Amino acid sequence: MFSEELIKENENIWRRFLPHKFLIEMAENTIKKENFEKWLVNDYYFVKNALRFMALLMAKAPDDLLPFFAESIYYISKELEMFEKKAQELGISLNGEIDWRAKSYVNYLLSVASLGSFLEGFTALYCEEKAYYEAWKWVRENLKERSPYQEFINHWSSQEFGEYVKRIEKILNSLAEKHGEFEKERAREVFKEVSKFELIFWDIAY
Amino acid sequence: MFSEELIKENENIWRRFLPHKFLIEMAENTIKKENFEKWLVNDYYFVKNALRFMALLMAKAPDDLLPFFAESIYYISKELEMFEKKAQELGISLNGEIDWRAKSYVNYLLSVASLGSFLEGFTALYCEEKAYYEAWKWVRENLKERSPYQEFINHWSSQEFGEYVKRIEKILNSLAEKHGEFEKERAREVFKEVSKFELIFWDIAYGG
Amino acid sequence: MFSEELIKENENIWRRFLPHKFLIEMAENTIKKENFEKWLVNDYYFVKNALRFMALLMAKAPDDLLPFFAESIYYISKELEMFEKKAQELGISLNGEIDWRAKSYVNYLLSVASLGSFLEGFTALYCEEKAYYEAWKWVRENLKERSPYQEFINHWSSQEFGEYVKRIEKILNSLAEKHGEFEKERAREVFKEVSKFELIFWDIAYGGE
Amino acid sequence: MFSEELIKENENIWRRFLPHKFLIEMAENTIKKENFEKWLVNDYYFVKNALRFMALLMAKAPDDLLPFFAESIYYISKELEMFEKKAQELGISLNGEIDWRAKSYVNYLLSVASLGSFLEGFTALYCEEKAYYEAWKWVRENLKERSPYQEFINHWSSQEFGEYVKRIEKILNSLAEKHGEFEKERAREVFKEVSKFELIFWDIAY
Ligand SMILES: Cc1ncc(COP(=O)(O)O)c(N)n1
């Protein structure tokens, strides 16, 4: 099972954001304002490009995955609304300055979808989604008080998002099955890289 | 208004499918099961790739259009279920051999979305959606009795799809306004080429 | 050996253009001016886009192939001048209407290069180059007398072009050996489809009948 | 004239690398071997990808620009040999770890060629080439003694490279002329972005 494998050889990296400083704070609501606001504007920018990334994947996707991508893009597209509501909730501007670490991650994703194989691309989608599910699972299971950000915690840790993640995992495993060792390694490498980007992204807040 | 200039200039091509023989038979219920089947199999293929085309445009689209694309692709994807459900009811396979004209049209849209400007791609989208809205509207306006294919007639001629087309139209006209002659002429040419594809597609039903 | 496999399973289609009506006429010099002109205008369009197709592959290619693609694109781009020279000498225009079969072949290649795997793309490249190498080689070998289009016959049948084809073959075979059968089948399909396009392209010269 | 306009709105960014600390050390022969080696490994990676960037542009290029792209890609590909021989001589490995700012500049370029318009992409080509032409031309106009890296200084400050830049500039100016103010400003933004990337790349060496 490709998915299990990907997680193992990178458990080392994942262990670093499970939990990360930002999540510990989130859970114990020690987490400061200036920090959340920074994460918000940057992740908002990521989500927008993650939608372009998904749309590029859909264009190269097998016929039988088309319904999946259309539903998934529409589903992920709602996250935008969430970010723009919580921004009119905090009187904060999203059209602000974007951190370099974020553009780096965005551009890497776009390049993979554009020039990489479909496996590498779907592999990156699994990584990124499964990374937020776990990180946010941790925040949920380790929550103390009330977080003025419960909406975000409720979305990425929800059974619904977990089902979405499981659906991706199942598709990924089937794809990998019919692919050789060479192509798998390329995808393994993409997963490693996206794992690093996930870890680095959390530092943007500070 | 760019959308109207596009329509005016390709009027003689559009008049050819408004109505096309296939539409006359749909409206008079004289359509042979054999011809519908061929159109169904080939159009299903087209719909699948039209979604890929849209996904390609989405990735190159301006930030303010991302919501429109996510919604439109989700909306258009429902057509797949419509085709599949209708195929179960008729015991028809959608895995058949695809006509050269269909593959040609598909590969052209894909190339436009991949290598062309966003204006060219969005213009192709408008042409292809507006074309079906007009074609199926004609069918609903001339339908003699209720058709065994009413589901398709209703979907492409509905107020909902009409609003979708209008939404595309508004965006297209705004985009065109901030572009120059050179770029517009490229789009005009794409609109012309897609128009011929739309006209030629109707003939697939009578292939073989 | 993937390359030989590809050829073996499509030998029926290739036989149809080895030789095709157009090649027999080139070889016997029975080729009418009008037929050559139509082929010229359309192949010139194909070559331009074949360059774009190769550039798309280059962008997706492994580091160790960058030099090959740089050299090949430069080499193949020379063909443009070859078409342009010949067109000047014949007082013929290359700005005319392009045949539907040609656009269809071009658009398929660009779709494979953009949305397909690198393997499928490179397989399409091999097929297209290998097809022309064989066709023009047939022409050089059945040429009764010297042709007014010797330039084209020589370029595609030359030892230099054959080396270029052999170089693509060696790269392809080696790329295939590290892929599975699912992905190989995808490429097999592309090779078949490109083969049909090659066979059909020759008919363009007689279009407008 | 588009080119002049691009250079004038980013003039303050350009002055930071005209000269940058790296160029000053190159000119005064005070540059340390560790810093040159890092720049070499990282730029080699950039050159390989710049080639993929150029090929992507070629795929979208107007018919009358195909000759130019074929020649330019061939011309620029020679740089790989230049880097490879220097690395042979220094007993240095090119297969090392590449800085993130480099991969980021690379991925930004790939995204622009993939998803952007042809003008945006060609505006990026001009910026990147023109930036090295001026950077290396500065080093040359300020050289104290003949440098051990004189070969790099000469290739990018050469008449041949300058003619290559001028050829790009002329094509860019014609293109911009037939484009309406909207896609122009889009390209202006890209120029600004590549400018910033050119400036950051010089820091990699340290
Ligand atoms: C960081 C950087 N920016 C620009 C260039 C020049 O481009 P080229 O070697 O591709 O002509 C370069 N070599 N490195």
PDB file of N, CA, C and O and ligand atoms in Angstrom, chain D residues 39 43 46-47 50-51 54 76 79 83 105 127-129 131-132 136 155-156 161 164 197-198 201-202, ligand 1:
ATOM      1  N   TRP D  39      27.472  29.486  -5.685  1.00  0.00           N
ATOM      2  CA  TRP D  39      26.781  30.204  -6.748  1.00  0.00           C
ATOM      3  C   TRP D  39      26.744  29.363  -8.017  1.00  0.00           C
ATOM      4  O   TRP D  39      25.737  29.339  -8.720  1.00  0.00           O
ATOM      5  N   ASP D  43      23.391  28.161  -9.762  1.00  0.00           N
ATOM      6  CA  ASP D  43      23.082  28.762 -11.049  1.00  0.00           C
ATOM      7  C   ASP D  43      23.007  27.704 -12.133  1.00  0.00           C
ATOM      8  O   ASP D  43      22.261  27.865 -13.104  1.00  0.00           O
ATOM      9  N   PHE D  46      19.722  26.587 -12.129  1.00  0.00           N
ATOM     10  CA  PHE D  46      18.866  27.597 -12.728  1.00  0.00           C
ATOM     11  C   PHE D  46      18.943  27.528 -14.253  1.00  0.00           C
ATOM     12  O   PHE D  46      17.915  27.569 -14.920  1.00  0.00           O
ATOM     13  N   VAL D  47      20.156  27.376 -14.792  1.00  0.00           N
ATOM     14  CA  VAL D  47      20.339  27.304 -16.237  1.00  0.00           C
ATOM     15  C   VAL D  47      19.624  26.114 -16.881  1.00  0.00           C
ATOM     16  O   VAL D  47      19.075  26.239 -17.975  1.00  0.00           O
ATOM     17  N   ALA D  50      15.997  27.099 -16.832  1.00  0.00           N
ATOM     18  CA  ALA D  50      15.742  28.245 -17.695  1.00  0.00           C
ATOM     19  C   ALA D  50      15.511  27.700 -19.114  1.00  0.00           C
ATOM     20  O   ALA D  50      14.715  28.238 -19.886  1.00  0.00           O
ATOM     21  N   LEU D  51      16.170  26.585 -19.411  1.00  0.00           N
ATOM     22  CA  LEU D  51      16.055  25.917 -20.696  1.00  0.00           C
ATOM     23  C   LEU D  51      14.650  25.319 -20.877  1.00  0.00           C
ATOM     24  O   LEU D  51      14.105  25.309 -21.986  1.00  0.00           O
ATOM     25  N   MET D  54      12.360  28.258 -21.436  1.00  0.00           N
ATOM     26  CA  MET D  54      12.445  28.737 -22.806  1.00  0.00           C
ATOM     27  C   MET D  54      11.699  27.836 -23.775  1.00  0.00           C
ATOM     28  O   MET D  54      11.108  28.317 -24.740  1.00  0.00           O
ATOM     29  N   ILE D  76      21.858  29.056 -25.506  1.00  0.00           N
ATOM     30  CA  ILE D  76      21.851  28.994 -24.044  1.00  0.00           C
ATOM     31  C   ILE D  76      22.264  27.608 -23.528  1.00  0.00           C
ATOM     32  O   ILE D  76      22.891  27.508 -22.481  1.00  0.00           O
ATOM     33  N   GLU D  79      25.779  26.902 -22.264  1.00  0.00           N
ATOM     34  CA  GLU D  79      26.159  27.296 -20.910  1.00  0.00           C
ATOM     35  C   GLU D  79      26.344  26.076 -20.006  1.00  0.00           C
ATOM     36  O   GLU D  79      27.145  26.112 -19.078  1.00  0.00           O
ATOM     37  N   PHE D  83      29.502  25.450 -17.423  1.00  0.00           N
ATOM     38  CA  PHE D  83      29.441  25.106 -16.007  1.00  0.00           C
ATOM     39  C   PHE D  83      30.100  23.756 -15.726  1.00  0.00           C
ATOM     40  O   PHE D  83      30.900  23.635 -14.802  1.00  0.00           O
ATOM     41  N   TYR D 105      12.677  30.396  -7.589  1.00  0.00           N
ATOM     42  CA  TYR D 105      12.803  31.277  -8.737  1.00  0.00           C
ATOM     43  C   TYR D 105      12.472  30.416  -9.956  1.00  0.00           C
ATOM     44  O   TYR D 105      11.708  30.829 -10.828  1.00  0.00           O
ATOM     45  N   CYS D 127      13.818  40.064 -18.815  1.00  0.00           N
ATOM     46  CA  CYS D 127      14.285  40.500 -17.496  1.00  0.00           C
ATOM     47  C   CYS D 127      15.482  39.682 -17.010  1.00  0.00           C
ATOM     48  O   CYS D 127      16.529  40.221 -16.665  1.00  0.00           O
ATOM     49  N   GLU D 128      15.320  38.371 -16.994  1.00  0.00           N
ATOM     50  CA  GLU D 128      16.377  37.477 -16.545  1.00  0.00           C
ATOM     51  C   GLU D 128      17.673  37.582 -17.353  1.00  0.00           C
ATOM     52  O   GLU D 128      18.758  37.510 -16.774  1.00  0.00           O
ATOM     53  N   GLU D 129      17.560  37.712 -18.678  1.00  0.00           N
ATOM     54  CA  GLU D 129      18.734  37.800 -19.548  1.00  0.00           C
ATOM     55  C   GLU D 129      19.407  39.158 -19.435  1.00  0.00           C
ATOM     56  O   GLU D 129      20.623  39.244 -19.275  1.00  0.00           O
ATOM     57  N   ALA D 131      19.176  41.150 -16.993  1.00  0.00           N
ATOM     58  CA  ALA D 131      19.736  41.328 -15.649  1.00  0.00           C
ATOM     59  C   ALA D 131      21.148  40.775 -15.538  1.00  0.00           C
ATOM     60  O   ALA D 131      21.989  41.360 -14.860  1.00  0.00           O
ATOM     61  N   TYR D 132      21.418  39.655 -16.206  1.00  0.00           N
ATOM     62  CA  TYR D 132      22.753  39.080 -16.155  1.00  0.00           C
ATOM     63  C   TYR D 132      23.709  39.865 -17.034  1.00  0.00           C
ATOM     64  O   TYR D 132      24.890  40.017 -16.712  1.00  0.00           O
ATOM     65  N   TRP D 136      26.960  41.197 -15.213  1.00  0.00           N
ATOM     66  CA  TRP D 136      28.287  40.779 -15.634  1.00  0.00           C
ATOM     67  C   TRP D 136      29.072  41.852 -16.353  1.00  0.00           C
ATOM     68  O   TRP D 136      30.296  41.914 -16.228  1.00  0.00           O
ATOM     69  N   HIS D 155      31.359  35.613 -21.029  1.00  0.00           N
ATOM     70  CA  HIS D 155      30.209  35.083 -21.745  1.00  0.00           C
ATOM     71  C   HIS D 155      28.997  35.996 -21.571  1.00  0.00           C
ATOM     72  O   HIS D 155      28.376  36.391 -22.558  1.00  0.00           O
ATOM     73  N   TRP D 156      28.688  36.370 -20.331  1.00  0.00           N
ATOM     74  CA  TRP D 156      27.526  37.228 -20.078  1.00  0.00           C
ATOM     75  C   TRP D 156      27.709  38.719 -20.349  1.00  0.00           C
ATOM     76  O   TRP D 156      26.732  39.474 -20.342  1.00  0.00           O
ATOM     77  N   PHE D 161      26.341  37.994 -26.354  1.00  0.00           N
ATOM     78  CA  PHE D 161      25.233  37.905 -25.412  1.00  0.00           C
ATOM     79  C   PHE D 161      24.425  39.210 -25.440  1.00  0.00           C
ATOM     80  O   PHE D 161      23.189  39.195 -25.381  1.00  0.00           O
ATOM     81  N   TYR D 164      22.199  39.169 -28.273  1.00  0.00           N
ATOM     82  CA  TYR D 164      21.125  38.243 -27.938  1.00  0.00           C
ATOM     83  C   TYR D 164      20.089  38.968 -27.083  1.00  0.00           C
ATOM     84  O   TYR D 164      18.892  38.836 -27.312  1.00  0.00           O
ATOM     85  N   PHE D 197      13.733  38.351  -7.883  1.00  0.00           N
ATOM     86  CA  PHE D 197      14.344  37.030  -7.850  1.00  0.00           C
ATOM     87  C   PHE D 197      15.819  37.094  -8.231  1.00  0.00           C
ATOM     88  O   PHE D 197      16.652  36.396  -7.654  1.00  0.00           O
ATOM     89  N   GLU D 198      16.130  37.969  -9.181  1.00  0.00           N
ATOM     90  CA  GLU D 198      17.506  38.182  -9.632  1.00  0.00           C
ATOM     91  C   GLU D 198      18.331  38.735  -8.476  1.00  0.00           C
ATOM     92  O   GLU D 198      19.475  38.328  -8.270  1.00  0.00           O
ATOM     93  N   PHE D 201      18.890  35.960  -5.705  1.00  0.00           N
ATOM     94  CA  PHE D 201      19.770  34.873  -6.136  1.00  0.00           C
ATOM     95  C   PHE D 201      21.236  35.107  -5.772  1.00  0.00           C
ATOM     96  O   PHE D 201      21.928  34.171  -5.362  1.00  0.00           O
ATOM     97  N   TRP D 202      21.700  36.351  -5.897  1.00  0.00           N
ATOM     98  CA  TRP D 202      23.087  36.693  -5.559  1.00  0.00           C
ATOM     99  C   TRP D 202      23.439  36.389  -4.092  1.00  0.00           C
ATOM    100  O   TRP D 202      24.594  36.124  -3.786  1.00  0.00           O
TER     101      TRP D 202
HETATM  102  C1  LIG E   1      19.978  33.616 -11.261  1.00  0.00           C
HETATM  103  C2  LIG E   1      20.186  33.810 -12.770  1.00  0.00           C
HETATM  104  N1  LIG E   1      19.401  34.772 -13.459  1.00  0.00           N
HETATM  105  C3  LIG E   1      19.640  34.898 -14.825  1.00  0.00           C
HETATM  106  C4  LIG E   1      20.597  34.132 -15.522  1.00  0.00           C
HETATM  107  C5  LIG E   1      20.814  34.298 -16.955  1.00  0.00           C
HETATM  108  O1  LIG E   1      20.031  33.477 -17.719  1.00  0.00           O
HETATM  109  P1  LIG E   1      20.740  32.524 -18.805  1.00  0.00           P
HETATM  110  O2  LIG E   1      22.061  31.765 -18.284  1.00  0.00           O
HETATM  111  O3  LIG E   1      19.636  31.389 -18.641  1.00  0.00           O
HETATM  112  O4  LIG E   1      20.870  33.121 -20.073  1.00  0.00           O
HETATM  113  C6  LIG E   1      21.349  33.185 -14.766  1.00  0.00           C
HETATM  114  N2  LIG E   1      22.299  32.400 -15.357  1.00  0.00           N
HETATM  115  N3  LIG E   1      21.129  33.039 -13.388  1.00  0.00           N
END
